[PDB]
Amino acid sequence: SGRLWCKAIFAGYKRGLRNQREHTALLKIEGVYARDETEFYLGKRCAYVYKAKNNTVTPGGKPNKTRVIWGKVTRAHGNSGMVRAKFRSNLPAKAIGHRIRVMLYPSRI
Amino acid sequence: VLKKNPLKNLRIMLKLNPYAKTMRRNTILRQARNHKLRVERAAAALAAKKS
Amino acid sequence: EPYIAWGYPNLKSVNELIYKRGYGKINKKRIALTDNALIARSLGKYGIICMEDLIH
Amino acid sequence: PHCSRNPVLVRGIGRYSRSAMYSRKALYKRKYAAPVLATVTKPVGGDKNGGTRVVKLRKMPRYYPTEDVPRKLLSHGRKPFSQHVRKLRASITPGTILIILTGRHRGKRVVFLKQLSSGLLLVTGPLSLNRVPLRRTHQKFVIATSTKIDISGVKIPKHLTDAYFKKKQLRKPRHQEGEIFDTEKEKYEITEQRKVDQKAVDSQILPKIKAVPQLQGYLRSVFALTNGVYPHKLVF
Amino acid sequence: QVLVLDGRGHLLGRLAAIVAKQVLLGRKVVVVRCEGINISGNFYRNKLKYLAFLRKRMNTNPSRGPYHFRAPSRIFWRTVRGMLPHKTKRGQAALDRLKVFDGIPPPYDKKKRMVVPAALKVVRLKPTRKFAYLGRLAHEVGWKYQAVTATLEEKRKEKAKIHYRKKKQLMRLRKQAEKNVEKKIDRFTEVLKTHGFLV
RNA sequence: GGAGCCUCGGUUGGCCUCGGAUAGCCGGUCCCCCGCGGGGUCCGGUGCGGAGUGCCCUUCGUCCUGGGAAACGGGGCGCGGC
RNA sequence: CCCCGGAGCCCCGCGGACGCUACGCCGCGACGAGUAGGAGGGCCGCUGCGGUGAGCCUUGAAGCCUAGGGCGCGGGCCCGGG
RNA sequence: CCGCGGCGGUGCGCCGCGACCGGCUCCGGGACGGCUGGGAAGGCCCGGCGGGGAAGGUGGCUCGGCCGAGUGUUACAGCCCCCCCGGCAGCAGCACUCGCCGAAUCCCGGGGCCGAGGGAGCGAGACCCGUCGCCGCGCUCUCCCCCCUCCCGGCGCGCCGG
Ligand SMILES: [Mg+2]
Ligand SMILES: [Mg+2]
Ligand SMILES: [Mg+2]
Numbered sequence: 001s002g003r004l005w006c007k008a009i010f011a012g013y014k015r016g017l018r019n020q021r022e023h024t025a026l027l028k029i030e031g032v033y034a035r036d037e038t039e040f041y042l043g044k045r046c047a048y049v050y051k052a053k054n055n056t057v058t059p060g061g062k063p064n065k066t067r068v069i070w071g072k073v074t075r076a077h078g079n080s081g082m083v084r085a086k087f088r089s090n091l092p093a094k095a096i097g098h099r100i101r102v103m104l105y106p107s108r109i
Numbered sequence: 110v111l112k113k114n115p116l117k118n119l120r121i122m123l124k125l126n127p128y129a130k131t132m133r134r135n136t137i138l139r140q141a142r143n144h145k146l147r148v149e150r151a152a153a154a155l156a157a158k159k160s
Numbered sequence: 161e162p163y164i165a166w167g168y169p170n171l172k173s174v175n176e177l178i179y180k181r182g183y184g185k186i187n188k189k190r191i192a193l194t195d196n197a198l199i200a201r202s203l204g205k206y207g208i209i210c211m212e213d214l215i216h
Numbered sequence: 217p218h219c220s221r222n223p224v225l226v227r228g229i230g231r232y233s234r235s236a237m238y239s240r241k242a243l244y245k246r247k248y249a250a251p252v253l254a255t256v257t258k259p260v261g262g263d264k265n266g267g268t269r270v271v272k273l274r275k276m277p278r279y280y281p282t283e284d285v286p287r288k289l290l291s292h293g294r295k296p297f298s299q300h301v302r303k304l305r306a307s308i309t310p311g312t313i314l315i316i317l318t319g320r321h322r323g324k325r326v327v328f329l330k331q332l333s334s335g336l337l338l339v340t341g342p343l344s345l346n347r348v349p350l351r352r353t354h355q356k357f358v359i360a361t362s363t364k365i366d367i368s369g370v371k372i373p374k375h376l377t378d379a380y381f382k383k384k385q386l387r388k389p390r391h392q393e394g395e396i397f398d399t400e401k402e403k404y405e406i407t408e409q410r411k412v413d414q415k416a417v418d419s420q421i422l423p424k425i426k427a428v429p430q431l432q433g434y435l436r437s438v439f440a441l442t443n444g445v446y447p448h449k450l451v452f
Numbered sequence: 453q454v455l456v457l458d459g460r461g462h463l464l465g466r467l468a469a470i471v472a473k474q475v476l477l478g479r480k481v482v483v484v485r486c487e488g489i490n491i492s493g494n495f496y497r498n499k500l501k502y503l504a505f506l507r508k509r510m511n512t513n514p515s516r517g518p519y520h521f522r523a524p525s526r527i528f529w530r531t532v533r534g535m536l537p538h539k540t541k542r543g544q545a546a547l548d549r550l551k552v553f554d555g556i557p558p559p560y561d562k563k564k565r566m567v568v569p570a571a572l573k574v575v576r577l578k579p580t581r582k583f584a585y586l587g588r589l590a591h592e593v594g595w596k597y598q599a600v601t602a603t604l605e606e607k608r609k610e611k612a613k614i615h616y617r618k619k620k621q622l623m624r625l626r627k628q629a630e631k632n633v634e635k636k637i638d639r640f641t642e643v644l645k646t647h648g649f650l651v
Numbered sequence: 652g653g654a655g656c657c658u659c660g661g662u663u664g665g666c667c668u669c670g671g672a673u674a675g676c677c678g679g680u681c682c683c684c685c686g687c688g689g690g691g692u693c694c695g696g697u698g699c700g701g702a703g704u705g706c707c708c709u710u711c712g713u714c715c716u717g718g719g720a721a722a723c724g725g726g727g728c729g730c731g732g733c
Numbered sequence: 734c735c736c737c738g739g740a741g742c743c744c745c746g747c748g749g750a751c752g753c754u755a756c757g758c759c760g761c762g763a764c765g766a767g768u769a770g771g772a773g774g775g776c777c778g779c780u781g782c783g784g785u786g787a788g789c790c791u792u793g794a795a796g797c798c799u800a801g802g803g804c805g806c807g808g809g810c811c812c813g814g815g
Numbered sequence: 816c817c818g819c820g821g822c823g824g825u826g827c828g829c830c831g832c833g834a835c836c837g838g839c840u841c842c843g844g845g846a847c848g849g850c851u852g853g854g855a856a857g858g859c860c861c862g863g864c865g866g867g868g869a870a871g872g873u874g875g876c877u878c879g880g881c882c883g884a885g886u887g888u889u890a891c892a893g894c895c896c897c898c899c900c901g902g903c904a905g906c907a908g909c910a911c912u913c914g915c916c917g918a919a920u921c922c923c924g925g926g927g928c929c930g931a932g933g934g935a936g937c938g939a940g941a942c943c944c945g946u947c948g949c950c951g952c953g954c955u956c957u958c959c960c961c962c963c964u965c966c967c968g969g970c971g972c973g974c975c976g977g
């Protein structure tokens with residue numbers, strides 16, 4: 001009856017200064033800021049969840065306007081608890097500075 | 110042929126050098142032996158502390 | 161000198177290099193030492209008939 | 217048909233040796249001094265006039281395709297799911313409590329009953345409390361809370377297994393084309409055996425849960441992440 | 453869902469740095485009491501440094517050239533604008549989240565407002581070092597509304613002092629209330645200090 | 652009150668002293684001064700801050716009946732005045 | 734101590750691919766910047782000739798156009814509709 | 816037609832799992848060697864031998880209630896410290912993490928990630944298939960016994976006989 005996903009912001013792509021490598025998102029998971037606090041989140045399912053003009057299908061549901069791009073937090077990115085993700089398609093860039101949901105549900109807990 | 114890494118893949122190590130089996134049979138047993146003997150020292154030290 | 165790092169390897173170093181990255185030169189084709197049949201075929205005329213002999 | 221005369225030391229390393237095993241197995245004293253045309257192989261039947269007829273079991277085929285794929289390469293260690301070995305997070309012990317993370321019973325709290333043959337969990341958030349029946353779940357989509365009921369001596373039915381907790385309907389042909397055929401059928405009906413199973417199991421648990429104060433009320437409630445509380449910080 | 457940061461006691465660029473990254477991660481921020489921002493380095497030092505910035509103008513038509521904003525809010529906005537990619541769409545979007553004020557006006561004058569302790573003067577500077585209030589600085593470079601901003605803030609502080617007195621009054625009654633009731637909240641109050649509050 | 656294109660972000664709230672930093676916070680004044688408060692002194696508590704943002708508030712299944720502790724609290728987008 | 738028109742086959746010397754356009758097919762290694770310049774291969778492309786497709790074509794050739802479907806690293810190509 | 820029997824290729828579209836191997840990156844455990852056959856330490860205390868700061872001391876002065884606090888001097892040990900002789904098991908590169916270098920003197924278990932890329936059956940009365948090398952084992956064709964007990968059988972949940 002509430003929220004079963006931890007909040008996270010799409011920081012932007014894995015990139016060098018002047019070559020962005022679009023196939024790898026970086027994820028600022030809310031409340032975690034140490035390459036330490038982040039072994040929880042390794043290998044968790046994550047959703048860029050967004051809605052669009054035309055209708056879609058929906059697993060166990062009637063046709064909707066919301067769509068998602070699924071992905072997976074792979075590894076911890078640099079000291080201050082950023083995390084790398086990788087998504088079944090690359091994230092839009094429209095997406096920068098927006099929510100992506102890091103689930104709990106490939107749990108090892 | 111795929112190179113399976115001997116150092117991870119026990120049976121590949123054995124294929125290349127069968128004396129590994131024994132060397133590793135020893136150094137499980139050896140380490141267990143000594144681990145037991147450490148507990149036995151620790152129990153005697155606790156008994157000496159109680160006395 | 162300023163093109164290399166070098167020095168005196170351990171026993172373990174010689175093992176780890178040979179087992180993890182031991183590749184024969186066998187008819188000028190870099191081939192991985194998957195069996196002693198390879199080492200023997202080439203070095204067996206010296207008494208070297210296995211990975212272990214090679215390491216020694 | 218004796219068992220394994222050397223035990224396991226490590227996966228792939230027996231405790232003993234070659235030499236100890238020779239003595240244990242006793243290879244001394246167990247020394248075994250041991251120094252078509254006309255006749256048709258596999259056909260045969262009966263029959264009347266002329267005589268008997270020679271049939272041919274497994275008769276050579278009446279169509280060959282123009283091209284067909286050519287075998288594989290044996291491949292060593294690739295077992296089918298049934299023959300697999302099954303794991304279980306040490307956290308999940310019998311009569312522990314879970315938070316089911318994924319399904320319709322989502323965030324609902326539950327009691328764990330057993331690991332089935334499959335490797336799935338069997339589960340019950342006693343239908344009574346939670347509205348969660350006898351039900352399968354996966355280790356991987358479940359949080360093993362550090363809260364246990366003592367469920368030791370409850371006789372879960374032997375007959376309830378993977379095979380029973382398994383979906384049922386739909387065969388092939390029928391009328392098919394039009395605006396009909398198995399878009400209806402409509403409802404999974406609960407059945408009476410299923411209701412009887414639940415009734416039996418819950419009663420054994422249900423007293424046990426209650427003994428723990430507030431536990432029923434905990435098992436009524438639903439888990440969810442509020443503000444300021446982060447999975448990685450908190451424990452369950 | 454929104455940062456409100458009391459810019460008093462902070463350091464101009466030090467705060468701006470932190471605000472920029474918040475703003476780039478979609479956080480809507482408000483920065484309040486910007487005149488109270490204070491800049492390291494003795495006053496005179498910084499005045500000249502500003503006065504130089506004033507000199508910078510497009511010779512042939514100043515009307516185009518770098519617009520030197522006087523108000524401390526706009527100054528602080530300028531320095532945060534200098535740490536975003538503000539020529540991009542995403543950069544421009546980022547600034548649109550940030551909302552700066554000389555003094556503290558009516559939405560936020562009854563909101564609790566945070567303090568970035570990593571931009572704070574008492575922490576980041578040696579006590580023997582000198583600094584400048586961005587107000588004074590703003591005032592002398594042409595900011596019109598110092599005194600107005602002061603006269604409105606004396607009202608606010610008087611208005612707030614009242615709120616605090618009433619708040620205190622409730623807190624006090626609540627401390628009394630517990631003592632009045634502490635045999636019929638005793639086996640609740642016990643359980644809230646087994647799991648470790650109330651201590 | 653009914654449908655019906657489109658644009659999206661969101662997925663508990665926090666309704667506030669002032670400020671200090673080689674110091675502060677709270678009480679209570681027995682006592683004194685000022686306009687229930689404000690200022691003072693004195694005393695008593697806290698101070699790696701539990702009158703803590705390391706915080707607080709809020710609960711997250713629905714109902715039934717039939718006990719206890721808690722109990723006049725909540726509502727009708729309840730209605731008029733200050 | 735015997736014969737494969739039958740040992741039943743992990744090797745079979747009695748006969749031999751699903752494979753064998755031998756300018757074919759298959760396996761192992763290694764390597765791959767490039768102006769000027771050189772060489773190879775182009776089932777890349779244009780126009781005409783000898784051969785050849787019991788080719789195609791008024792039941793619609795060439796050309797032209799195409800937010801149609803594809804192939805090829807590419808030169809290019811093939812189909813759908815007009 | 817029902818068998819979804821056996822084999823072969825497949826999935827309309829979106830999904831998930833599982834175990835096996837390869838390559839990685841981490842985590843947790845343990846067991847060893849060497850040294851100034853580590854240095855320091857700890858613990859028990861005993862006998863001596865000096866030296867230093869500076870003391871349950873004394874003393875000038877100061878500050879508080881003979882006592883407590885703050886400076887100052889000569890300096891023994893009744894606060895300690897340091898050297899020297901002689902001797903105990905508790906040490907152990909020590910979870911009292913004070914300072915190394917390592918591993919035929921080294922092993923076990925666990926997590927995250929990416930990838931699977933090949934295809935030694937095209938016979939007419941007898942497999943549509945295994946498997947090579949390595950590990951051992953495991954088993955049996957050898958007898959013994961012991962235990963537990965899952966199925967089944969028997970006797971009184973207990974005991975006895977795969
Ligand atoms: Mg939604
Ligand atoms: Mg080249
Ligand atoms: Mg050229």
